[PDB]
């Protein structure tokens, strides 16, 4: 029943150093990804190209704001960039998350179309265009991340002469409903960013595997190899996104559910202190992708 409140040491400059490294690597790799996608022949731009471009754009937008968070963490959680940049950086973080998961969902749906229902794939390509899908996913990401832009603010919480960039549910709720608003926003973000998109992803992958089981005894070898390459890079991207954003969402949801389950003091403190590392791991995904392209996609190696 001691109920400590402080965190474990300060992690030194490890989190800011990782943020800066991800900033450099993500900028370079995502610029190279966009250049490779938009430099090749436009007639040879597959449907995966637009989703890869949107993924790179989201990663670039997030890694642009990453140095601000590195500085924030370096100075013992002090925000010197004002309320506007707090709002913009947090909004870009959530926009990156939503856009990345939506683009991976689109890639998985495209693989399901081209692997399970080639005729329906052609029909949907005739109906659904890549530009429309990209615009819809980006607009949806912006709308879903707007609450963070609205509610985030900067305040000298706790009287430590350190302005902190925190979500302020004071405007949209009283004290008695601050927890309700926080839990609702967090659960909705976790759902629409990691549960529904990954449910769609897993359904698509299950049907792809079911069709490939039969395809192991039939189908053209060359087309099978091309599908293998594209499906491999897309599955690697999906799995990397899962491993990177699963600690963040899991710890967030556990913390939210702790209020309902009345979790012990020690577990709440442990989640509190482990959350920054989950946040760093989630940020690393914005730079991990170009290396995955390099090691798997033959097109990127050629360029």
């Amino acid at each position, epitope marked *: 029943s001691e109920c400590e409140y402080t965190d474990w040491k300060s992690s030194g400059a490890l989190i800011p150093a990782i943020y800066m490294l991800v900033f450099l690597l993500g900028t370079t790799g995502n610029g190279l990804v966009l250049w490779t996608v938009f430099r090749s022949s436009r007639e040879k731009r597959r449907s995966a190209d637009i989703f890869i471009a949107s993924l790179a754009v989201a990663d670039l937008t997030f890694v642009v704001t990453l140095p601000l968070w590195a500085t924030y963490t370096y100075r013992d959680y002090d925000w010197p960039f004002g309320t506007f940049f707090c709002k913009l950086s947090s909004y870009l973080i959530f926009v990156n998350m939503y856009a990345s998961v939506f683009c991976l969902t689109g890639l998985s749906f495209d693989r399901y179309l081209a692997i399970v229902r080639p005729v329906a794939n052609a029909r949907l390509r005739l109906r659904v265009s890549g530009a429309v899908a990209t615009a819809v996913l980006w607009v949806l990401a912006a709308l879903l991340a707007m609450p963070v832009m609205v509610l985030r603010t900067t305040g*000298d919480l*706790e009287n430590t002469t350190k302005v*902190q960039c*925190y*979500m302020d549910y*004071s405007m949209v709720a009283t*004290v008695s409903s*601050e927890w309700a608003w926080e839990v609702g926003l967090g659960v909705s973000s976790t759902t629409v960013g990691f549960v529904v998109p990954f449910t769609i992803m897993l359904t698509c992958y299950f049907f792809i595997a079911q069709t490939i089981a039969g395809h192991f005894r039939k189908e053209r070898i060359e087309g099978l190899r091309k599908r293998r390459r594209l499906l491999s890079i897309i599955v690697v991207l999906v799995v990397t996104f899962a491993l990177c954003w699963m600690p963040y969402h899991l710890v967030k949801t556990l913390y939210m559910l*702790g209020s309902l389950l009345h979790w012990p003091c020690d577990f709440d403190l442990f989640l*509190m202190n482990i959350f920054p590392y989950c946040t760093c791991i989630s940020y690393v995904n914005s730079c991990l992708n170009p290396f995955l392209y390099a090691f798997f996609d033959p097109r990127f190696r050629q360029a």
Partner: nanobody
Amino acid sequence: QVQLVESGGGSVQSGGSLTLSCAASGSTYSSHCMGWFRQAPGKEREGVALMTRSRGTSYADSVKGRFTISQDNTKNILYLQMNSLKPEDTAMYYCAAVPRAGIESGAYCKWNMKDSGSWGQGTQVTVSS
């Protein structure tokens, strides 16, 4: 629905030790942060001892060492041991609960919102000489 109830804080001459406590309701360690404030007649209310995520528990200059704040989550209680009083310690004390920021922010207690948070009824700690 967070509610607070005070206790103790009677009348003891200078250099004594007052055992003072505040109960709680609907407030958990993961949702609210507690603190003891004092308001003295003729001047403004001040902070005495705040349960503070950063820098640990925070104390006022006039209460360093002499006071001690503890919290029990199971019973949802907050304590204070006003040992070695001074003639200037006569004031009315309150227990205040503020919402705790989300895990994304860092779970810092929202003490700037201390006015909008739930405040205890208070007790007239009458420290004599």
